[model samples]
Target: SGSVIPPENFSHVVGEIYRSSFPRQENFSFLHERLKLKSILVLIPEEYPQENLNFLKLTGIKLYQVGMSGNVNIPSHLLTKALEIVLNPANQPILIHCNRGKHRTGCLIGCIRKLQNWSLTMIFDEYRRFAFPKARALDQQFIEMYDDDEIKRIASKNNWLPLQW
Candidate 1:
């Protein structure tokens, strides 16, 4: 078999919404060849990595970076913006990532699960799995409190509801 080096914590989160840790130079091939991604949503409150950005430009994958600090006080609008990029099929085959793909990315994915009408049991179950070893209470509470009504409405209006696998 051919070699494939996926980024750490990589996973498919319903439809085209993928989750992973920050990718590096060596992981480009997997990102390009295997996933064939159209876009990426980065959720870190820091400068984008140069090498990863180069890969996106080289392979023509779009980039959506919504910088968010690792805090429970994360602004609601930031998550809303992220949901927009993920819900858009045009950005299909997209990957959502943060520093470790545990805290920040987990919260976003948790919000997504809520939007998908997932049970809290399953949502936290999935969240903790990714953020295992030290799932923060703040992040969990933020995910639990995030309101998806507006995002759901916009998604429905745009005919992007019922996100499919």
Candidate 2:
């Protein structure tokens, strides 16, 4: 398992939305203390060993898992669920993460940017900033091709966010 220091102003950008790599025993408490996250969105599949997350669960925070693998196309249904979870007001102060906090997390963020009406350049910039040398063309392609109309419709219904696009 690996971990990256949470970005400064992370809680500010998305209102308590924290992104990170896999949680290890060492940093589990660190995350708990730092973010006090109300919920966690784990992109890794549930069949995998998530001992570190078990520790997080002991603290009583809600956990949502999407069961995706790295370096593959994100399924539309899973993408919808991910958007639903992240945008849902009840899941605010949520932590969204994958093994390295790169591909899967970046893709999800990219999708969110689409909903926010962000230009592709801006979306790719943020995704590249985090994904770095390991950035995947497939992930970028997914972001570029993602249809946000449904998300916008759902958001409008729920008043989730002011999706300008």
Candidate 3:
């Protein structure tokens, strides 16, 4: 199987670091190889690519898919479940990517930042580092998804960082 950047590149990132794409095309395989990745978490939407599924299987790379809307917001439980799957000790060197690698992938990173109790500046900075300049606009949607109070609650529970959240 192909992969993205080395996990070390995103070590500061909470949970797993990833790359994403839209439509999950076959050409992504080239990018994966270029990045020297071995395994990855493919955050597929409700509909998946059958041909690509077979290709991914034959390549011996791991794929973790979930049903989702393209919006940059995912339910809390779904985020946790994905973490449970990808963070398993056995699943190392994994890359998490959605179609387009911006919206959905960005949402996942935002949720992880919440879990890590990262400050707004830290979170936004880290997100902006990998996403397009326009991607910052999605911050409103992410904020709306978890609001202030709810964010603190989840952050406290995850013990993601030293913050008081």
- Listed in order, each prediction's TM-score against the native is 0.95, 0.85, 0.61
| Poorest lDDT segment (10 consecutive residues) of candidate 1 | 67-76
Off by over 4 Å in 1: none
| Per-model tally of clashing residue pairs | 0, 0, 9
Off by over 4 Å in 2: 1-13, 46-50, 163-165
lDDT of 1 by residue, 55-146 (tens): 98899999899998965577789999999988899888999999999988998999999988899889998999999987888777888899
Model 2 residue 80 lDDT score: 80
**lDDT of all predictions:** 0.89, 0.76, 0.56
Q: What's the CA RMSD for each of the models?
A: 1.3, 4.0, 6.2
Q: Residue 20's C-alpha lDDT in candidate 2?
A: 75
State the lDDT of candidate 2 residue by residue for 1-165, as single tens digits. Answer: 545555421333365567777766666666677777788888988553568558756888788999877645788778888989978878767888888888888888889878878899988988888888887888999899888888888889988777321
Model 1, position 101, has a per-residue lDDT of 97
Candidate with more favorable, higher TM-score: 2 or 3:
2
Q: State the displacement of the C-alpha of residue 17, model 3, in Å, after optimal TM-score superposition.
A: 3.3
- Considering TM-score, where higher is better, how would the candidates rank from best to worst? 1, 2, 3
Q: Please give, for residues 1-165, the per-residue lDDT of candidate 3 as tens digits.
A: 444433222322433344555424545545356543456666656655677667567667666776556644566666666665544535545567775565566666676666555687776776666676556565536633654355445445665334221
